[PDB]
Amino acid sequence: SKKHTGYVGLKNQGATCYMNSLLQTLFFTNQLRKAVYMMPTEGDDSSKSVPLALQRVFYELQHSDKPVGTKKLTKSFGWETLDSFMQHDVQELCRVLLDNVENKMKGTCVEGTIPKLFRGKMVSYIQCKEVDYRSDRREDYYDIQLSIKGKKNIFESFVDYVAVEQLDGDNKYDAGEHGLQEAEKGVKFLTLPPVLHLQLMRFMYDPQTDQNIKINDRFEFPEQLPLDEFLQKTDPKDPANYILHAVLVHSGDNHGGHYVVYLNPKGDGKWCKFDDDVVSRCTKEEAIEHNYGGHDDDLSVRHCTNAYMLVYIRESKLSEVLQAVTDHDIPQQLVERLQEEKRIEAQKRKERQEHHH
Ligand SMILES: Cn1nc2c(=O)n(CC3(O)CCN(C(=O)C[C@H](c4ccccc4)C(F)(F)F)CC3)cnc2c1-c1ccc(CN)cc1
């Protein structure tokens, strides 16, 4: 019941693993949700259209009193079995969704929304120590994969992310005409985006077992996250101070485990747990510290419940990313089309029941 929290859940349908968690996460990225509603999907085929199918899911999350279905969404991007989810990381799903919607926004009043919210800039470098040669590769990024093994918290992971590696000994850099050279290799952050998607590296290759295994190591992350020290050049008008928005959690050892997401949708520290169709109020401690993962001095049970993805929002952007969404933000054109789709699927049902009964 939406009456407990003001928020509605998503149906437990098929085997879509992390999908519901990511959908709630994107739905509460209000600036994104607004842009999604603006997509000119009138000409679209509802079986094939990811943009239309995401409009439908966001609309129903905003308006429906009952849990929201995702079958037409999964059909539209073609991940209709468990295997589809097992062959992709959560960030890959996010990119499928965000790339589809950004493409549909091309040449509209919301063109550029996806990069505006999610894209940062980095540069990857290799610097020769004995000779005058440097290779610089500038890249956009939409998410960051953070190493956790042997790291206590987010801060130690970021230190390790920008750590300078020595390319020496047998590991010298092929510097072309300069020959093999001792060098140093690193990554620098130039910008950090308004909405910062961090995946934790919990699904690690293991030689012994020979495939990926989930690691349950305790790894701590804060409500407030200062990142100025990880930028090449800071901005005194806009420090890289981040506020925790969402914690995506998994329990178990495999894709038949259980996926939930914790959010404080307003960015005000008031958290809810979203567990498919049940959305419930929760403590901040339930959202945050309880998802750090079990203490290694506790042999009571297997501690297989922990965070794998965090969404942080930049403090200076918070009021704009989380801008309020009203009925006026949904075009009547789209409202009518979604009602039309509802009638059409209300009849596809009855014709299926006629031919099967
Ligand atoms: C090493 N590594 N581990 C990464 C990880 O963990 N995640 C989170 C996730 O995608 C979430 C979705 N996954 C699953 O549902 C499988 C389940 C799981 C594993 C670990 C944590 C939570 C659940 C499982 F295995 F079934 F229990 C797979 C793992 C994402 N990028 C992860 C990477 C990674 C690092 C670098 C790159 C290159 N940019 C790509 C991926």
Q: Which of 203, 255, 259 to mutate to test the pocket of ligand 1 (most atoms within 8 A of CB)?
A: 203
Shared-domain flag, residues 311 and 229: yes
Q: Which of 4, 178, 258, 295 is catalytic?
A: 258
Q: Which two tokens stand for residue 309?
A: 């993805």
| 355 in a structural domain | no
H or E stretch including 326?
none
In angstroms, what CA-CA distances link 262 with 31, 193, 272?
Answer: 19, 21, 6
Query: Are 152 and 219 spatial neighbours (Cβ–Cβ below 8 Å)?
Result: yes
- In this structure, the answer to whether residues 219 and 73 fall within a common structural domain is no
Q: Which residues pair with 315 in a beta bridge?
A: none
- The answer to whether residue 96 is domain-embedded is yes
- What span, in angstroms and rounded, lies between the C-alpha atoms of 120 and 194? 9
Residue 148, phi-psi category: left (phi > 0), alpha (psi -120 to 50), beta (remainder)? alpha
Are residue 89 and residue 216 in the same domain, yes or no? no
**Reported resolution in A?**
1.7
Give the CA diameter of the chain.
Answer: 80
Q: Among 146, 310, 303, 298, which residue's Cα sits nearest to residue 216?
A: 303
Q: Which of 309, 202, 292 is nearest to 248 (CA)?
A: 309
Residue nearest to atom 4 of ligand 1 (CA): 201
Identify whether residues 322 and 258 lie together within a single domain: no
**Closest to 2 in 3D by CA, of 69, 55, 60:** 60
| Residue 200 forms part of a structural domain | yes
Are 267 and 279 contained in the same domain? yes
- In this structure, are 181 and 219 located in the same domain? no
**Which residue puts its alpha carbon closest to atom 33 of ligand 1?**
201
Letter string b/e over residues 25-47, b meaning 16 or more CB atoms within 10 A of that residue's CB = bbbbbbbbbbbbbbbbbeebebe
Same domain, residue pair 222 and 267: yes
Distance CA 262, CA 183 (A): 43
Question: Could you give the CA distance from residue 242 to residue 313 in angstroms, rounded to a whole number?
Answer: 5
- Method of determination is X-ray
Residue 153 carries which side chain, given as an amino acid letter? Answer: N
Taking the C-alpha atoms of residue 177 and residue 30, their distance in angstroms, rounded to an integer, is 52
Catalytic (active site) residue 128: no
What does the DSSP 8-state code read for residue 233?
A: S
Three-state secondary structure call for residue 172: coil
- For position 128, which CATH number holds? 2.20.210.10
Pocket test for ligand 1, best of 89, 92, 144, 255 (most atoms within 8 A of CB): 89
SS3 155: helix
Domain count, the chain: 3
Exposed/middle/buried for residue 121 (C-beta within 10 Å: 0-12, 13-18, 19+): middle
CA–chain centroid gap for 230, Å, is 21
> Do 275 and 147 sit in the same domain of this protein?
yes
Q: Which position has the token pair 């209000």? A: 30
Residues 298 and 334 grouped into a single domain: no
C-alpha to C-alpha distance for 305 and 223, rounded to whole angstroms: 19
Range of the domain at 44: 9-119+316-348
Q: Could you tell me if 250 and 259 are in contact, meaning their C-beta atoms sit under 8 angstroms apart? A: yes
In a domain, 239, yes or no: yes
Of all atoms in ligand 1, which is nearest to the CA of residue 202? 6
**Residue tagged active-site, from 4, 17, 128, 356:** 17
| 312 exposure class (CB count in 10 Å sphere: 0-12, 13-18, 19+) | buried
Q: 256: CA distance to ligand 1 center in Å? A: 14
Helix (H) or strand (E) holding 136: strand 134-141
Q: How many helices (H) and strands (E) does the chain have?
A: 11, 16
Same domain, 89 and 188: no
Which residue lies with its CA nearest to atom 24 of ligand 1?
254
Distance, CA of 293 to CA of 216 (rounded, Å):
6
Ligand 1, atom 37, residue with closest C-alpha:
145
* Residue 55 lies inside a defined structural domain of this protein: yes
188, 259: one domain: no
Whether 175 and 52 map to the same domain: the answer is: no
